[PDB]
Structure formats: C-alpha cells, structure tokens
Symmetry: D2
Subunit: 447 residues, 4 copies
Amino acid sequence: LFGTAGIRGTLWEKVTPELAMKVGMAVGTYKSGKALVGRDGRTSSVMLKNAMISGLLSTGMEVLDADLIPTPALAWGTRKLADAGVMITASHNPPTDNGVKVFNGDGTEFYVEQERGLEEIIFSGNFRKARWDEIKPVRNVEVIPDYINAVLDFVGHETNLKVLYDGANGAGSLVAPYLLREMGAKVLSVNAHVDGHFPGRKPEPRYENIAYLGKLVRELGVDLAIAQDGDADRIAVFDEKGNYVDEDTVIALFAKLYVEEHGGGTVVVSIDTGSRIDAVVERAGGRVVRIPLGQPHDGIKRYKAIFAAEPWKLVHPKFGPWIDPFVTMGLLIKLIDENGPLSELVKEIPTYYLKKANVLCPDEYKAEVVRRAAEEVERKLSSEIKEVLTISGFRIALNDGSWILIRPSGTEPKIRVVAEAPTEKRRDELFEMAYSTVSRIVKEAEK
Amino acid sequence: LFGTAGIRGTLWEKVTPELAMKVGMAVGTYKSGKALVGRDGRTSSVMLKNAMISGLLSTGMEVLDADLIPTPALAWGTRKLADAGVMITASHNPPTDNGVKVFNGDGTEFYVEQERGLEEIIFSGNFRKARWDEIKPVRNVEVIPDYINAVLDFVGHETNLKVLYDGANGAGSLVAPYLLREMGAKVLSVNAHVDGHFPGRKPEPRYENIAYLGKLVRELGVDLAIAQDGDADRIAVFDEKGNYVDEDTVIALFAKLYVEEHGGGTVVVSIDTGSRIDAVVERAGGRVVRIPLGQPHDGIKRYKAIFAAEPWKLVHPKFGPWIDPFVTMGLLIKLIDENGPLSELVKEIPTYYLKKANVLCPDEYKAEVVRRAAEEVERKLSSEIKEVLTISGFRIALNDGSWILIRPSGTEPKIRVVAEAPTEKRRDELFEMAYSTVSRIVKEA
Amino acid sequence: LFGTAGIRGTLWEKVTPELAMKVGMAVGTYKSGKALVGRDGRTSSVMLKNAMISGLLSTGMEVLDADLIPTPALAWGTRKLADAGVMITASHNPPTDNGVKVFNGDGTEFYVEQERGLEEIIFSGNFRKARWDEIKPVRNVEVIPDYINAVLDFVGHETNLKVLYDGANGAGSLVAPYLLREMGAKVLSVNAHVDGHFPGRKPEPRYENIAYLGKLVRELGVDLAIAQDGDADRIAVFDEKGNYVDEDTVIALFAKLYVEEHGGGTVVVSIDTGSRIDAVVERAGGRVVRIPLGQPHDGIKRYKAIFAAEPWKLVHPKFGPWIDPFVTMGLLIKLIDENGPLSELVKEIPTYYLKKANVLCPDEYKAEVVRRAAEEVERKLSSEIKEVLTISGFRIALNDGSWILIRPSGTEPKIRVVAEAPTEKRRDELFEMAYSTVSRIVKEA
Amino acid sequence: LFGTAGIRGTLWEKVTPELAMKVGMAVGTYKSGKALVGRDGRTSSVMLKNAMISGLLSTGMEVLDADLIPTPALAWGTRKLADAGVMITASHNPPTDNGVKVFNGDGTEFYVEQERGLEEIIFSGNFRKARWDEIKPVRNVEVIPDYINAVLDFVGHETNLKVLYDGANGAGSLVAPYLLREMGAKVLSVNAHVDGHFPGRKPEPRYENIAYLGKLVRELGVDLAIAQDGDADRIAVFDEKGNYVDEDTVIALFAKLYVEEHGGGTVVVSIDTGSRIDAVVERAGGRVVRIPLGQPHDGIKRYKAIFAAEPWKLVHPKFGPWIDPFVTMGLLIKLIDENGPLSELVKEIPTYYLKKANVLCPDEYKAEVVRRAAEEVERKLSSEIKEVLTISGFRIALNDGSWILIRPSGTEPKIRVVAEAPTEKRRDELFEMAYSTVSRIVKEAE
C-alpha cells in the first residue's frame, strides 16, 4: 500500500472508499486518542474523508475534522492537537488519483516500520472495535488561521515585495495568499480558486507545467513567483526576470543560509539532488549526507541535521519536521529583502548541468539490470570515482563533482537515469554512457 | 437484510460501517439523481452516516445531508427534495443497535421488489462507480423548520392546551416541542435532550416503559401526554386523568373521525389491531381491510383507503404516505379543542380486552407449528367463525366480535399469540386456550 | 446601565439592539485583543449577539463566537481563550427581557470601575474605530466539550446515581445532562430542550416555580433533582425524598465540606444568607464574613476565602472565580456517593426558620425609609444584639443566633424584608414586627 | 443615503454599523416576510452584515443568511426565496468603503420611491418592533450552486474555449470559475482568492486597472479574458489577441443578438452609451431608448425592453430583472463557438471614437453651469441637432451619429463631459467645443 510519500493511486483501481475505511480502522488499532483529519480539493476527497472518518470513529478515536487544508498545516495541526493525523491527497498526481498520508503526534510522516504495521493490520482485518458507548462525537476545528500565525511568528519578517502565487487550484490557495498579504506582500494569484478538476494546469509544479509564469513575471513587475501542487507540500520559484530557479538552486540557497548561520552542521538531501548543494555546504564548512527520496524528516533524527530537502520539498526543523513551503516562501522573501534580488542571489550558486530520462524495463528484471549496469559504469569511470552510494540504487560520484544516478522507481515499470557535471559536454558524455549502458542491458534480458 | 421496516441489528454483529457503505453503494446503483440522508442520535449514527454517504457519493448520486432529523421529516424531505432517502436508525431498539431505512422519492419506504434488488446488488458486489469528474459535492440542508411549517399548515389549528412531551432522548426532541409551541401548546418536555445512551428510559413507548407519565400528568395538570421512539415515528398518548390511551383507542379515534367527514370509505390497519376499530368504522358507514405489519401505505394504494395504522403508527395520506406522528399529535389536540377532554372522547369508544404473549419457536419450525395449531383452533370453535385471513399467519374472527391471531414473527425466533373479546372472561378463555395449543405443539418436534 | 450582576431589562424599554452595539463598542475601547461571545436561548439573544459582535469588530477586537453556551462556560472559556467575555442573557428574568454580562480575561465579572468606565464611554460616544485593514475575521469556537472535560477532571468522581435535571428550557440543557452522563449518572431531564418561550415554567429556580419536582422525585425514584435558570448560572436541589433543600442548606453543606477539609479557613456568603452557614462553619473552626449580593469572588480576593456563595450561586475558587453550578452539581453527587443519601446529609445541618416578603417603595424613598425604619428596631432589641452589619442596608444579629434584614433592592422599586430564628415563634414575631414597621414609615411621606 | 446604485461611502464617515442596523430596521418597516442577506469580501462586510441582521430581526422579518455571495446571486436568490434582499457591498469602490444595496422580492433593485420611503423611516426613527415572541430564528442558506445551475440551464451551451477569469479578489471568484468549468471551459483564474485588501488590483474593471490581462491573453493562448468587480455585478472583456473590447462594443454584440432574434424590439441603454448600439439596433429593425445610469432594470417594465445595459452592466430580462454578468460570460462563450473568434465578431461592430474628461465645479453651481453650457453648445450645433435628451444632464445627438454628454455627477464637485463621433477629427473638434465651453463657464461663477 505505502509508496515513498504515502498511499497513492488511481480511483477505483487502488484507491477506494473501502480502503480509506480500512486505513482509518488500522490507524485506530495502531494509534489511539485523537486523529486530526484533513483533505485536498480533489473530486474524490470528501468521499474518501467520510470513509476514513467512519473507520477512525469505529476504533474509539476522537476525530478532529479540519476538512480542506494543505498537508503542512495538517502536519502542524497534528502536532498541536492530536495523537495521529490523516491527510486525503495524491499531492501532484492527476485528478483521476487520490491517496492517504498518515502522520504521528509530533507531525512526522509515518516511518517505514509504522507503514508495515498498518498494512499487517489491514491484511489481517484485526481492527480495534469500540463499544457503542465509547464512539466519540466528531469535533470540527479551524487550523489555517493558527497555522498562518505560527508561520508569521517563525519567519519574523515584513515586506513590500510584489509576489506571483500559483495555487494549482489547490489547498495552498486557502493559506499562501493570506500569509504573503499578512507579511505585507502584494499578491497577484493565479489558479488560487480551489477546484478538483485542476483547470489551470497539471498540479505538479514541474517547469514544463508552470513555464507561462516566467512570462507573467516580466509583464507584471513581480519580485518572485511561487507555485505549488494540489495539497501545497511542494514549492517552485521564478526570479524577478522570469528565470525558473531550479529545485537544486532553491535547496542550495537555504543549505548555504543554514550552514553559514551555524558555522557548519549536517545538511540532509535526497540521493537525486546534485552538487550545487555539496559545493555551498563544503565551502561554508558543513557536510552532506544523502538518503532515499521520500523521508526528508528521517535524516534529521539519524544525522542531527539542521536542514533537509528533496527537489521541491524543504524541511525547516526549528519550525517542525514536516516539509513546509509556507516557511520556505516566507524566508525566501526575507532572503531577497535582506540581500537583494533573487536573480543576483542565484549567481552566488555554482552552475551544474543535469540531464535525466526514464528507460523502460519490466519489474521482474528492474533490480538485476541496475546492479549489472552500476558495475559496468563504475568500471568505465574507475579513474574518476569519489564514492558509490547504494542506499537507493547506485549514485556514482566522480572526483570533479559529476555524478550518475541509476535507480528503479518503486511504482512505474522502468529505470530512472540521472547524470550531472560541471560542464554541458560532460553532462552529455556521462548521460549517454549511463542511458545507453542501461538501454543495451535492458534489451539483453528481454531476449 | 431488510425486515418489516428497514435493516436493523446490533453494532459489529449485523450492522457495520462496511454494510452502511455497501447500502449507499447499492442505492446509487439501483437509483440515480439525489439522495437525502438523515440520522437519529444513537452513538454510532454519525459513523454509519459517514460510511453511507461515502457509498452514495461513489455512485455519482448527489447527497443532501439533513444530519440529525426524525424519520417522518426524512420521508417528507425525501419527497420535497430527492429521488431517494436514507435514514440511519434502529427506531426503538437499545443503544447497542442501529440500522438503515431506505425511502423512494414519493416518501414511501422500499417495497419488497426493491429490497431484494438491493440485496442482490450487495451480494453481487457490482456497484455503479462514478468517474472522478461525476462525484458531486455534499449539500447541507435544514429540513426541520420546513417540515414544521408543513404540519402546521396541514393541521391548521391553534390551541391553549398544556402538553407533556416525552422525546425518548431522541430525534423528536428537535421537532415536537417547537411544533406544539407554534400551535399554542404549553410544553413540559421530558427526555427532550438528544442522547444516544437513552438515559431517560428504553426508547420504545410501550406503556411499561412510559407509565411514570400517568402520575406526572396528574401533578402537572396537563391535558394530554405524547411519547415517542428515538427516531420519533411512534406516538403513545395519556389523557388528562393520567390514563394510558392504548394503541387501538388512538387508531379508533382517527378511524372514527376519518370515516365521518368522508361519509364512509376504507380504513387499512394491521392484522394485530382489534375490534375497537371495526366497531366505530361500521357504525359511521365505512369498511375495514387488514394487511401484515410493515408499511400501512401499501394498503392505501391497494385498497384506495383514507386512513391506515398499526399500533403506535398512524398514516395521514392527505399529508403523505409515511407514518407521521407529528400530524397525529397536531390532530389529537385539534380533536380535543373542538370536541372536549380526551378521557371523554375515549369513553365513546367501545371497550374490548386484549391479552398477548410470545411463545419461543426456532426460525426453522415457525410455519410448521402455526399450520397445525390454527386448524385445531378452527375445529374447536367452528360454530362461531365469522372469517379467517391467511395473509399473515391466521386471524380467526368469531361471531361475538372476539378474534384469535396466531402469527409467525420476523426479526425474532418466536410465534405471536393474541386474543380480543368484548368481556374479560371471554378474553381470558380464548387466550389461555390458544396459548396452550401452540405451547404443546412446540413441545413435540 | 449596570446593576449588581449585569445590564438587564425589558426588550425595547432598556435593552435594544442599539444598546447591545454601544456595549460592544465600549468593551473594545476599554480593552483590546480577543473577545469571547456567548448567548442564552431567549428569542432576542441572536439579534443582540449580532449587534454586540458588530460593536466589538468595529474596535479592532478579534471576536471568538461561542454562540449558545451557559454563563459559567462563557466565564471559563474567557479565561482559556480571550481578554474579555460577553454573555447575551437576563439569566432568570422572564422571556420579555434580555441583558449583557461583561467578563475579564481571568473570568471575573466586570468590577465597578470597569462598569463606570464603560458607561462614560457609552454616554461620551468616543469609541475606538479600527482602520478598514484592522477589522478581524470572526472565529467560531466550540467550548462546551472542553468545559465539560475541565469540570469532570476537577470533580474527579464516577457515580451510578439516578438524577432529575430541570434545564428551564435554557443553556444548561446543552451541558448538565452530558456532564452528569459522562460521570455515570442516569439523567432523567425535564425542560431540557432549549426554548426562549420558557414553556416549562418560570426560569427562576425558586421553590414555587419548581414545586412539581418534589412529587416527581418520588415517582421516578431518583437520588437527587437539580434545577437551573435559563443561563444555567443558578442551582436549586431536591433530595431523594422529594424535600426541597433550601438555598442556605446547600450553601452550608459546601461550607461544612470546604472548612472541614481545610481545618478552618474563611467563607464569604451574601448578607441575606442565614445562621445555618454561621453554625456549620464555627463548629468546624472557620470564619463567616457577609458582603452584598453582587460577585462572591470580590470576597475571595478581599478575605482570601476558600468558598463564597449567595442563595442559588456557589463559587469553587480552586476551579475558577465564577459562579459554577456544574462544579456544585458534580461535588454534590460525590458528597452523596461518599456519605450516604442526601435527605440524611441535610439532617446534619442545624434548623432555622426563615420568612420574607417585599414592600413596594419608590426609589427616592428607599435611602430614606430603610435607615430610619432600622434605627427603630435597633433600639427596641438593643439588649440581645451580637452585631449590626450596615454594609448593605441593615442586618441586626441577636445573641440567640436570630437576625432581621431591611435592604433597598438594586433593580426594583421595593424594600426587601427577611427574618430568621432557631424557633417557629421567635421567627413569625420578628418578620411581622419588621414588615409592618416599614409598611407604616412608607405611608408617612 | 441612496445614490446611483445603493448606499455607498467611506467607512466611519457615511457607512457605519449604526447606519446598517437602521437600514435593516427600515427594510422590515417598509417590507414584511423574508429577507435574504448577502455580503462581499470587504474587511468591514461581516461587521455590517451582523448589524443589518440585528436590524432586520428587530422588525419581525425572517432572516435567510446567504453570507458571502455575488450581487447577481443575491438578486436571483431573493426572487427565489424572499420578499426582500440585502447585499453588503460598495461593488467597485476601494477597500476603505462599503455600502448597502436593497432588492424587492422579484429581484429588482429598489426604485427611487422605495429609497425615499426608507430614508424617511430612518430619519423619523419609527421602525416596526417585533414582540419578543415574534423574533424569528436566522436560517443559513446555500444559493451559489442553485444559482450556477440556473445560469447553465439558461445558457444551454457546452464549450472547450480557454478563458482568463480575473475575480478582483471578490465574490465572483466563488461562482464564475465553477460556472465556466461546468460549461467545459479551461479556466485560468487571476485574483480568484477572496481578499478584502483587493491585493491583485483596484476592483473596478476599467481598462487601466486590468490592462495587464491583454498581455497575459497572448502569452497564455486564451480565447477570451473576463474581468469583474468586488461583488461581481460588472463584466469587462479582452479578445484572443489581447484587445480590450470596450464596454459599448460588449453592449452592441448583445443589442444586435437580441434584436436579430426578435426581428425588432426596444433596447434600453444608459444616457452615456453611444452610437455603436444605435447602429446595430436600427440596422436590425429595433429602437434604442435612453435612461439615466443605475436603473437598467427600469427599462424592462417602463419601455417593454428585450435587453438593457449600461457600460459594464448587462440585463438579460428573460433570466431576470438584474444585472447578470454570469449569463453574459456564458452567452459570449456561446457567441464565439457559434460565430467565430471574438476579435472577428467585434469587427462587425461599427467604429466610433469617444473622448471623456471631468471639469471641477463647486456643487452650489454645477446645475447652472451645465444648463447654460448646453444651451450654448446646442446653438453652436443648431444646423446639426437630431435630439437633446434632458432626463439626466444634457445629451445632444447630431444628424451624423455624433453626440455630446454634459452632466453633473450627483455625488462630487465636477461635471462629466463625453463626446463621440464617426471620426477622430469630429471626436476631437466636438470634445474641444464642449470641454472648453464648460471649463470657461465654471470660472465666471468663481
């Protein structure tokens, strides 16, 4: 059931009312006391929330119903109010899809160990049943105003910046515009009316889904563009010139800020974030530990990290251990007002050049093909190896700051192939090697 | 799954979230358009309503959420607003129980065809599945105030009577006090805070549960007492003396007034309602048909009748097809204001005397036992037999207005034994005979 | 505008939407930050709450709207949530009336200088005005469940008692029956549906408005009857024998309880409470001080008291400064469960005999009549005299524990007369002296 | 208290909680039965709505609380649900201001006679007071989804057009995006999160507040842009090329559509809508009658009109006697899908050239300066006069389709001066004559 980022899938195939009721029933067998429930704007979300609540109620848990809320606010509100938290969302997936994310009473997403717990209870049907006289009444709660205040107290900044905010027709529309305006920003919102058909654009704030914003920034005269996904756990940014600031740069900006403050410390990033981060962290005298994509919070506990991130998701541990783009965009505005325009701050981040691509493989082979292709690429680059990470596929780092990721995704039946180098010519050289080496090996096992 | 009146049963045994959702899914596979959804105050109802609503939504039906409402208001609202109605309730059962009642867009409970249809669909697992872009938002609706206005306009009576209302800690507490006050009634309410532990009393307004009201009537100086079940589709009444006005006298009163205004016409009642009703209806020039316990309005269509009833449950078809105790309490008060105290109006209703007991019998041998027992009673009394009905067990009617009913039960494993006579002796004789005939057959096989 | 415990009067006469708006304006000129807003169930209370809320918002205060909650829950919620509280209510006044009560961030009612401060601002019309961009959104808050949990945690007692709860169709109906149920009590409720017409009875839980409850306690076999007013700040109790436990007996029971645990300590009662409190407190080695009818907490601050009370209104300082009958309720159940049936417990209380009546008197002839009709009775009986109190009219205490009270009413044009003595004779002779001493000096002018 | 379109003003100066409570007390003295109450997103709207409901309750009226709703949804819901309608809004004014609009049970705005009735009642203090036992409980109602269903039913059109919707941070944002999506439109919204600070732009959809939209239309490849005000009773449009379609062109598309349908009929437009209406109405065999600003509904009963409009505000009598930009945007999409791109459709509208400015005049003179100036411009144009309307200021129509408006606004120390002509030279020449004539006569009385 759980992938890397919760339970996610297409309606009727994987995600059903029946399952959502099973997950509530399992959350109230594994955990007890109070459950904070929230949902995103998808057409199926109220249907799945009513199932979830039916499930949670059946176990004797007191349900606190927050209804339509961004995921971060559900994580924050869970810490403040509840013993467990449940979010109805498929985040960045199309409107055919929904899912469930589960949170603990400290605001952290479920650990791998806790997910397997919940699945064992679902597979067994061994659910805690309340007596009739232990079934607690639902309590409606209003979290967004408290969340917005907690984010303004944390950020401690006033602005006059003009800001373009793109809400993907999602839960961020009920929080980001108001937060920015409270800070004294002049907000021009796009896709900031909540709509589960995602009429504005595909909700995932990939560059190709939000490219129009770069043009909007120049015409409008804004200091900064901010885009989100449907449950607003992601953040994407454009500068005052309408340049897309890519995800590694956004992370590098904060990785530098955090390490320089502390005069050092551990930063934790995903296996698939690049050398912009190692570059600015080492120069300022801290270190980088890489972990699998999915659990940026996990790294904080293990490595005592001051900052953790994956592409589009930063964690601000002094605020709390959830991905918090509301903190992120608040602090990005403080960075600009305190140091000058965003395009000049991105110049102080070194250029690397990434090139990724999927290369299709059956799920039966997947793992064999990666293991055999990592060995071959290592051998061909043996003169240049700095380190091989094995924690999530194979990340091969080279002496000059280049690296290759060869990794199977947990879901789709294919292999992820990333290469990054300090030059375009070498981005191309290494990507070709990695791509074609995987391509050729795939078609071997396929005959 | 469906008995006489909805799906009922105990939490976790037969009634679950899983089933509540499958029923929603079934209703939205069998019908389309709008579902009006309501619940009573049991501790499990919001949980089941959540599951139900998930069900309904998954089929592309547009849910209207009326939340905590009495069943008659759900029936009325279903006719105003929706193509189907669903009610989370077990009406008069203990706090441990809940269930679902399903209504059509004209306000009638499911007919047997439609119950079976729904049962097949659940068994099949073949539920209609909306596409993501056909799942409809929930609409919250406030029914009670419009329901109250509709009763008030139908009854068209102001009053100054003092009324004692017992809402059985249930859904009636949100409606009857306010309808009585709007009519002019001075209401003293008991058990009129909503609570699914039913702390005040067992919710079923059987005399044995509501008999304290008798003495309360005396002290408080009230004209009338009204008592209800947890979803408020039952009504029981006490008079100004504090005397219980049993369920046939109540039906008799309504039978009498309906057959008079008309100048005759048909009155459908249950197979277990006795001769108080036959007496007033023939005297005022009308006829009585009988059906099985379940939906009095089945009768109305079938026997073009002007009134129908079972014990506690009266239908006023000029208003609508559903059991409507809110109409009943409004017309009882109108009756009294126009004609004089209730105790006076009940003297003008012939006495008969009823004794009833249940004899346990396995759900398996029920048809078998009755069969023999009834033909034995037919033989032992053959000189007197005026009529035998086989529609629900056997109702053996004698020449001297007496009768014996020997009926198999539905949701319990017992046979139901009843006698009505015009004397305490002729009663005691026909019952302590009829009971021991069934009793002795059950002690063989 | 303010009397002893709030602004109150007749709709359209003294209390208007206009006044309700000016008070909101005045509160948010005198204070800043957050205002918690609550109301009782009177017909006019939503109209005045809207006017009140418009007032507060206009000053830049952040309004927290609790809607329909009892006064104690508003005072409790104010301490938890806000810088000021506002209650729309006239507590025990008839349905023709409403009012406002203003609370501080610690949950105390308006102190006199706040009252005067507020009145000058209203007369002046110089109200703080928010700029457009400082008017704050209303926040809806659910207080009752949290207030219920706070009271349970403080009473620390589960029971199995049967209890008769009479909510005067008022705000207590949404709270008492559920607090009693979560403890384990089997609640039988009367007048426990909210109704601003107060159909059940006069909302003031005077013996003669709630008399009927006595013969009802016997009938149902309850261990205790509890009655409140419409805002539920008041409590009145009958025992399992259906004997009215008069209001000093209740006070004395808690007096005894609070002083015995402590080993002495001081007890603030109002000037018109009797010798029952004097006796159980001295006996237990504690000290009794009298203050005027108003706010019993003024006593806790001044005299570091462990317990304050007036007739029908107890304060439990360990919980909070407000009159809290939800705490009284629960500690009284815990008393009975720990020391036996209530009728027994009221026997361990000394008996005195009380009589009172009102003499109509113009406002300008109150200051005059009393002082000069008290000079007189002070001289006649200056043999016995143990102490005269003049802090609130004249209260003449004798050496045999007897006493007389002549007092000018706050909010009505009449002189109040009270006599109490250890004996049936000594009582009836004092009341008849003092009552006709006034009546006579009235017809001088 | 009432100006053109309801009671409007700056917070604390004219518009107060105490005023809003008086207006409620007045409406429940002038009218009986049920009152539907709505508001816009202004920071003061909840404060004034609470005061309004307090007033209305005090008179025994049954209050139906629709909360935050656009004005057109309030007029339609009033017709469905109630005997009176109240809207808390200052519509297009800055966030410093608020206001009250009142509506009859048939969904018409209050007539001048009805406004005086209310003002007298407010000025006398003689409000109907309910007895305690007649104060009715407030009923919360959900109008928007019923309203969207009625507009979709009335429009009878499915689409796949791309559409830029600009909600000006206002009540339109809760209806227009959903009504467009349900028609099949691919909606990209700007300023479609409600906020009383109007952070996106000034909510009045004059061209100069919404100029940026024309630029976004091109970049984004949209077929149509639609911009509204704060209460969404106004509509403004840009075509697929980012061309601002001016308010007379929008009215004219619809005058022509309505007059071609009926082969004739009367169209009622305000005194300051110009000649492109006359061109398409006469060419299809209909006639144009003019009335003053603010009363476009008054045309329907008075002149039996099939369509009525003033700049930004169109009435579709067959749906209701209120300004309904939701019906408008729906019918524009239907127009475009059935006839071709918007830019092509506006080419079939004859070109006139307008030029407007104000001239400062003390309130004490105003009337005198306009009367004298109009007599003087008439005489100078005497060889050319088609018609001179006096119903609101002086509108001087010439034989060639040109015209001059000289009008004192009934709320400000200035005189409004319009001139339109088939040609640029004639525009300039006629505007030069009228502007300078008025400008001179002002300073003599000084």
